[PDB]
Design a protein around this ligand. Structure first.
Ligand SMILES: NC(=O)C1=CN([C@H]2O[C@H](COP(=O)(O)OP(=O)(O)OC[C@H]3O[C@@H](n4cnc5c(N)ncnc54)[C@H](OP(=O)(O)O)[C@@H]3O)[C@@H](O)[C@H]2O)C=CC1
Ligand SMILES: COc1cc(C(C)(C)C#Cc2c(C)nc(N)nc2N)cc(OC)c1OC
Length: 157
């Protein structure tokens, strides 16, 4: 299964200056729950924004860099390589990889952040005309989670 896993705001912002623009522990838990024991695929820039692989799952980085080597990370050098990865594979970022993959994936796990943040990195436009809403669940507003947010699971029609 090939899925997108992303959090974006009302204008599809996903990042600003190598950071997540918002602080949402609930969404980090969501990522942990979905991707633990599976595979994350990310572009080089996305990986370097975290600096280390996430524990208890396969971490795959796409780069043209033939020297690229990080403990706990498996490297791939083309998009075609993604289709040979076994199991449930989640496309994890960033803008470039999402642009390359959005027309290819089976489904998308999207956290909609109900705010408007300053951004420099964007999720590509998409229409609900092409995507069925399998589930839509409101996140809990909290002491530690102060931005309204919704977990969507969208399946390609
Ligand atoms: N929410 C998120 O996903 C976040 C993402 N980001 C980031 O994304 C921002 C914008 O950069 P963006 O380009 O979208 O980042 P990406 O994570 O998509 O990384 C792009 C890089 O991935 C590699 N790559 C992509 N496609 C291919 C391909 N077909 N073949 C070989 N290599 C490929 C290249 O690495 P190389 O140049 O090494 O060859 C390319 O420069 C960055 O500023 C970074 O911080 C920032 C914050 C949050
Ligand atoms: C998992 O934590 C981070 C993830 C990320 C990335 C960009 C790899 C991501 C993501 C992501 C999140 C947070 N939520 C959802 N739903 N999908 C994603 N791809 C960047 C970070 O800092 C810049 C993170 O904090 C260390």
């Amino acid at each position: 299964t090939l899925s997108i896993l992303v959090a974006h705001d009302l204008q599809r912002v996903i990042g600003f200056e190598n950071q997540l623009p918002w602080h949402l522990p609930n969404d980090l838990k969501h990522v942990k729950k979905l991707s633990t024991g599976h595979t994350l695929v990310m572009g080089r820039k996305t990986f370097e924004s975290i600096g280390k692989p996430l524990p208890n799952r396969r971490n795959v980085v796409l780069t043209s860099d033939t020297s690229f080597n990080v403990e706990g990370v498996d490297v791939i050098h083309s998009i075609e390589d993604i289709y040979q990865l076994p199991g449930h594979v989640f496309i994890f970022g960033g803008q470039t990889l999402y642009e390359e993959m959005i027309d290819k994936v089976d489904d998308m796990y999207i956290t909609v952040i109900e705010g408007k943040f300053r951004g420099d990195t964007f999720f590509p436009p998409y229409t609900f005309e092409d995507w069925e809403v399998a589930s839509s669940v409101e996140g809990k507003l909290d002491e530690k989670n102060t931005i309204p947010h919704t977990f969507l699971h969208l399946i390609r029609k």
